[PDB]
């Protein structure tokens, strides 16, 4: 009677950057849906393809728990059929995404007075990300005609930037911790059931 490790994902002390988002593979467990069952109003809760009141009555093959950090103005992109720097170049959700997205303001945790430059994001990429694609490459992005060869110069920039979360910023520039729960049901034994 193993319980699905949801506390390790929501109650984590440190979250990942959006470009290197962490994923916890959860399987063969009993899902105590309670972290998302009754959520307070100050939680952004949007489900797609599945109803939350029905999750206790469904068994899934695998449930993926993706966690990362973005700013408030970018949470609207963590959704199916969305475009933007986060959606296209950091963390993309498919058009037929089956699962829920959870986000809450973490300005009291991930924002320092002198700036918390630890969280990063990808600004430049040659093409868009496929759904559930994670690109941790730090190669100098070529924006011109001459090859970069690992040289930071004109039309050759580093593809990652910092967020610099300071508590005195607006709500749109404050850190938000996002937890994306994907519910997969393929030709396999269903093991993640509810109770």
């Amino acid at each position, epitope marked *: 009677t193993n319980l699905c490790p949801f506390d390790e994902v929501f109650n984590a002390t440190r979250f990942a950057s959006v470009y290197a988002w962490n994923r916890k593979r959860i399987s063969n467990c009993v899902a105590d849906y309670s972290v998302l069952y009754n959520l307070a109003p100050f939680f952004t809760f949007k489900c797609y393809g599945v109803s939350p009141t029905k999750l206790n009555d469904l068994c899934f093959t695998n449930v993926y728990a993706d966690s990362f950090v973005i700013r408030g*103005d970018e949470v609207r992109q963590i959704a199916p059929g969305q475009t933007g*720097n986060i959606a*296209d170049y950091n963390y993309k959700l498919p058009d037929d995404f089956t699962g829920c997205v959870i986000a809450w303001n973490s300005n009291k945790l991930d924002s320092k007075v002198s700036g918390n430059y630890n969280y990063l994001y990808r600004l430049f*990429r040659k093409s868009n990300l496929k759904p559930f694609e994670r690109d941790i490459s730090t190669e100098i992005y070529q*924006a011109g005609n001459k090859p970069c060869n690992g040289v930071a110069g004109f039309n050759c920039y580093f593809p990652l930037r910092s967020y610099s979360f300071r508590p005195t*910023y607006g709500v*749109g520039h404050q850190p938000y911790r996002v937890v994306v729960l994907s519910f997969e049901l393929l030709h396999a034994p269903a093991t993640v059931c509810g109770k």
Partner: antibody
Amino acid sequence: QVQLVESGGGLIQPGGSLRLSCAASGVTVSSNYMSWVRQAPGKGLEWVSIIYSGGTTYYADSVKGRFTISRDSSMNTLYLQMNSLRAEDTAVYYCARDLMVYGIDVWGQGTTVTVSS
Amino acid sequence: EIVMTQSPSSLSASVGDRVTITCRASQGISSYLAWYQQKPGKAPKLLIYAASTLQSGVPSRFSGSGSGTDFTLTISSLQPEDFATYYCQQLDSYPPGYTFGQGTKVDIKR
């Protein structure tokens, strides 16, 4: 030679259509944030549209449903299709390479569009 | 939409003066701001990005400062080739737009 060369502007009646071109050399259009900026006579700069390197496009409210930004990678050219043009669209139109937080470093010389009856 | 209020609309300065231009955002935009210079008939020229970082090639007398809502462009010692019109820009993704300031014309004082 890093430059942006605009063309396609001219005189047109209200309601008509016009297509602007932005020939780039040095900067690869399909690899950058490419934006159109216009400036009416005596007024400030007004952002029009942007196209991300990944295909995401964005438009100002005054030009939504009327302007459509596009590109041809084989030509290394940026385009701005202007439909249902109005008198207030009379401006010099610049195509530019946007570096987001690093600013807008590369600007074209601009092509003039005049919409009048 | 974010409204970038830039003041003054115009200011007069002699060569060697310390010029200060102010840009105020409707909402917080952290350090997502840039400063531009434009002369009649020319394209804009990027001066400062990320509110306070000097673009490569721009003379060191230019400097940006501020974070959140209030930002200032500073020309420590005005030179003859600095009489132009300056704009601030909200170079931030949300909320769309990318708005520019109203602009500040810096003419020759006598």
